[PDB]
């Protein structure tokens with residue numbers, strides 16, 4: 221398996237997800253920096269540096285987007301699952317291994333959950349993409 | 359926690375609608391002068407539309423309401439009661455038909 | 456004849472995949488059921504597909520043309536989908552040769568948008584311009600067909616292999632005629648289908 225091809229497919233998948241989030245009009249207008257209280261469980265500006273941090277961040281975003289009842293978020297969650305599997309395949313390269321208030325915010329504020337989740341996901345993916353050019357540590 | 363008065367408003371184009379909100383920040387109600395309003399977390403509503411009902415109850419008035427443009431599954435506009443830069447997750451549902 | 460071919464096609468938005476297969480060789484054999492089975496591999500397709508023991512049934516709908524259509528939604532763009540047809544007879548079961556399809560490689564892109572066509576009279580060239588579709592993100596190749604607008608368009612085709620080309624200049628024989636232009640695109644690596652022709656674009660003349 222050509223690792224260069226895996227990295228290229230990872231970059232292409234990240235760009236695809238970023239474009240999908242860009243196409244959702246009501247998400248680009250929301251500032252990912254402007255903090256929202258009550259949604260601190262959604263990885264805001266954590267300095268993503270390790271492979272395990274990327275994996276846990278994407279797993280959190282996956283679990284959050286799974287609860288939303290839209291088909292766009294379901295598709296983004298599946299794409300994130302593929303991205304996570306690609307990250308595990310990239311982790312197996314450099315020979316290194318990797319290891320409930322949500323219900324209330326989904327029931328009361330679905331719009332806030334979706335908007336903040338998608339804005340944080342877009343920011344995290346742009347950071348991962350920009351950091352993929354530099355060889356990342358395990 | 360935040361409380362909206364009223365929790366939801368259903369109205370038609372051209373009508374006026376007002377929302378009241380209470381912001382209890384970490385066990386203390388902030389001053390109504392500190393409360394700012396946001397629309398769908400996208401744009402701050404002009405302060406001209408704000409009205410200080412009392413020291414704790416803030417009010418926002420919408421005039422000549424335009425038909426709410428639906429954003430995918432969301433056919434309503436999410437009105438937010440915020441404590442300056444820090445907004446809350448709970449919003450008010452404004453339906454304009 | 457259990458040699459049934461299954462063809463899958465991913466929509467231009469990469470939101471669903473529709474697979475088609477004909478039961479033309481099994482309709483005569485009644486008293487037994489025929490259903491599509493599939494298995495998903497975390498990443499990519501194996502070099503030689505195999506009938507995995509663990510699979511799940513997919514609900515397919517019979518169409519007016521006699522083919523069954525099974526729609527997968529949502530999809531896993533980079534997951535390998537191994538699928539085959541299983542016939543469950545009272546005497547046992549028979550399986551068609553399995554095939555593995557990668558949804559990323561069977562994407563049918565949307566046609567190029569914002570297609571413009573202009574004739575620069577200073578040079579006498581037909582300048583065509585377009586905007587690539589939102590998806591896919593991979594490098595694309597373009598094909599331009601152009602002709603004089605009339606009763607029966609006499610099409611001419613031009614191939615563009617420059618992935619970063621957003622325009623093409625074609626030398627036409629009649630500079631005072633109105634031309635109609637349509638553009639379609641396909642993945643540069645050829646792993647996919649050609650898009651539909653874009654909405655017609657027309658030039659001006661004065």
Ligand SMILES: *[C@@H]1O[C@H](CO)[C@@H](O)[C@H](O)[C@H]1NC(C)=O
Nearest residue numbers: 372373374375419420421422
């Ligand atoms: C609604 O607000 C406008 C804003 O100027 C005002 O002119 C109008 O009288 C209001 N309507 C009612 C019924 O209060």
